[PDB]
């Protein structure tokens, strides 16, 4: 949460990841929207708080479990 300002999405379902490159969201989670190139599996940032060190890495998820912002 870099406060970028570009492309912000909600979830509204909830989902899992199965693969270390996607991510987990749940309904009423942020994330931010690296790549919408595709209409099924979007590819949007997350935020990990690891030993008070704050991580990034983007991750594919359904879009169909979440929608844009505006």
Do not use: C, H
Not at 33 to 47: C, F, G, I, P, R
């Amino acid at each position: 949460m870099d406060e970028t300002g570009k492309e912000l999405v909600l979830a509204l379902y909830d989902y899992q990841e199965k693969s270390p490159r996607e991510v987990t969201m749940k309904k009423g989670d942020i994330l931010t929207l690296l790549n919408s190139t595709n209409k099924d599996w979007w590819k949007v940032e997350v935020k990990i708080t690891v030993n008070g060190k704050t991580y990034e890495r983007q991750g594919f998820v359904p879009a169909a479990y979440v929608k844009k912002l505006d």
